Amino acid sequence: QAGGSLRLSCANSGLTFSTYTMGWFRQAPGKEREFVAAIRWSGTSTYYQDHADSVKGRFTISRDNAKNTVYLQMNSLKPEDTAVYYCAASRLRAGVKAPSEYDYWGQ
Amino acid sequence: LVHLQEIKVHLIGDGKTSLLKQLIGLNVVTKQAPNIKGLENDDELKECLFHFWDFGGQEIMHASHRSSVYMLLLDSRTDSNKHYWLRHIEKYGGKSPVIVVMNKIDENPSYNIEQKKINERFPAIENRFHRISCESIAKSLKSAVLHPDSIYGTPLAPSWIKVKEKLVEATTAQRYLNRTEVEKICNDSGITDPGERKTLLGYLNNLGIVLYFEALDLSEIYVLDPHWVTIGVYRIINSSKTKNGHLNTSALGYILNTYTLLEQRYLLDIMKQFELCYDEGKGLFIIPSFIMKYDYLPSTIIPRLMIAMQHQILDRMQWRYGMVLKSQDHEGALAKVVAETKDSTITIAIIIWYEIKKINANFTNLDVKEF
Ligand SMILES: Nc1nc2c(ncn2[C@@H]2O[C@H](COP(=O)(O)OP(=O)(O)OP(O)(O)=S)[C@@H](O)[C@H]2O)c(=O)[nH]1
Numbered sequence: 001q002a003g004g005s006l007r008l009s010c011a012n013s014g015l016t017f018s019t020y021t022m023g024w025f026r027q028a029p030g031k032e033r034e035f036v037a038a039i040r041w042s043g044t045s046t047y048y049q050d051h052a053d054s055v056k057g058r059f060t061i062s063r064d065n066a067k068n069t070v071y072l073q074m075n076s077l078k079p080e081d082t083a084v085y086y087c088a089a090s091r092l093r094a095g096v097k098a099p100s101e102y103d104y105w106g107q
Numbered sequence: 108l109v110h111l112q113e114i115k116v117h118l119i120g121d122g123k124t125s126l127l128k129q130l131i132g133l134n135v136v137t138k139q140a141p142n143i144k145g146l147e148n149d150d151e152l153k154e155c156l157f158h159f160w161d162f163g164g165q166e167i168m169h170a171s172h173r174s175s176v177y178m179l180l181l182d183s184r185t186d187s188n189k190h191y192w193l194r195h196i197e198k199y200g201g202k203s204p205v206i207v208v209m210n211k212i213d214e215n216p217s218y219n220i221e222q223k224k225i226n227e228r229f230p231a232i233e234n235r236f237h238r239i240s241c242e243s244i245a246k247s248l249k250s251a252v253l254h255p256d257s258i259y260g261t262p263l264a265p266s267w268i269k270v271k272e273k274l275v276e277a278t279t280a281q282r283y284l285n286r287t288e289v290e291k292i293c294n295d296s297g298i299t300d301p302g303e304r305k306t307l308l309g310y311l312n313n314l315g316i317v318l319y320f321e322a323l324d325l326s327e328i329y330v331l332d333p334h335w336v337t338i339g340v341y342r343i344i345n346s347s348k349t350k351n352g353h354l355n356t357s358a359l360g361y362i363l364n365t366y367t368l369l370e371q372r373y374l375l376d377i378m379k380q381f382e383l384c385y386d387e388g389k390g391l392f393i394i395p396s397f398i399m400k401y402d403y404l405p406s407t408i409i410p411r412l413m414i415a416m417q418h419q420i421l422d423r424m425q426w427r428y429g430m431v432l433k434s435q436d437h438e439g440a441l442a443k444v445v446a447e448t449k450d451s452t453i454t455i456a457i458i459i460w461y462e463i464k465k466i467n468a469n470f471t472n473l474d475v476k477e478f
Contacts, residue, residue: 019108021440045152046253051152055233092262093108097255
């Protein structure tokens, strides 16, 4: 419901991991895969950890290494912000914060 | 691959001790996540290096001592001169995240700046503000470090980090590398691409461990150590002998003193190369630190306009904020250019405009006003 909560979990098993960054992209009406929140987490460490537009507090991003999962927490959801979320994996190790390198699309 | 996990922070005042209370330093101090109070709770950045630099003064002007975070510092009496350091961060530095903090709120608990207007005016802020006196500073710092416009987690080959460590080991003692030695260390790992070596040196410089400029033009020194080569410029730029306006012939040993006469004339050549002063003759030194108005009046525009010493000058007539000129060209003209920091203006008494434009050309979209 409007301004509620919604935790989405995206799991990846047996892949590069270290050479991989997980980014969430929201685009329902062909919105050209707009960037929402990415994380280059390596164990307890985290390198990129950046947001866009709605920013933090509104949207929370976390990663747990216990089951190799990334969690997107939806809070104060604005009804017009209706879009479908996709997981994307970046693998290039030359140049941090690589949007165009999110080639391996998730589920 | 292997990431870098390092960053530099320059404190930009007009305070600095107040933010040194969060550290528990004449710039260039190193800290880790446990060292910072209030940010050690997050294990996200446990293995992160922090470099803190800070200065302050009126005639002290070292524009070049992303890949950093700038915490601008404000005080109620200095809010009139606020556009200065903000435009300085916009022009020089990089595209680094900026955190504006207002300090000493206890003396005036009713003063708050219009943070919205400056936040929209400066897109590197993004509402990272504090109004504390002597913490949200830790949260702002964390949210600023992990930014695409900054380098904290950057994937580079491990050979690059070995080369960086070897360069640090060489520079902490030698203090100045040769181009031959730079290439030798670079090709120790086999890397000889000018682009690759250029990026490695840029990541070494923009993080402020080993400096490197494109205007040295000296074969004796290629890169250089900020722990000594910047403090050296700091000593000579003000020693109460340059306050009067003229430095002695070679009495830099009286100023300074690991530093000797060889390093003395190394740094002499360096300071003439940085376009800060002119050697005139017989060991004389200037150290210069119509209606034309500049927002963010560059601190070193008079030092660059006074390099033309063998040109129009009447006789040793310098205000340390101005000068007097006497045209030696065809006919006879008397001129004088003087600066006013409190008004951010320059005056002209009656080539001069050509030199002013040639000096201000080294700026990126610096607004100017003529009257
Ligand atoms: N006792 C005490 N003194 C303070 C406090 N805050 C500021 N001061 C005083 O302010 C002075 C320093 O002002 P400060 O804002 O740090 O200027 P600065 O950093 O030295 O100069 P700058 O150009 O880089 S901004 C010190 O003398 C210090 O005593 C405080 O909370 N307690």
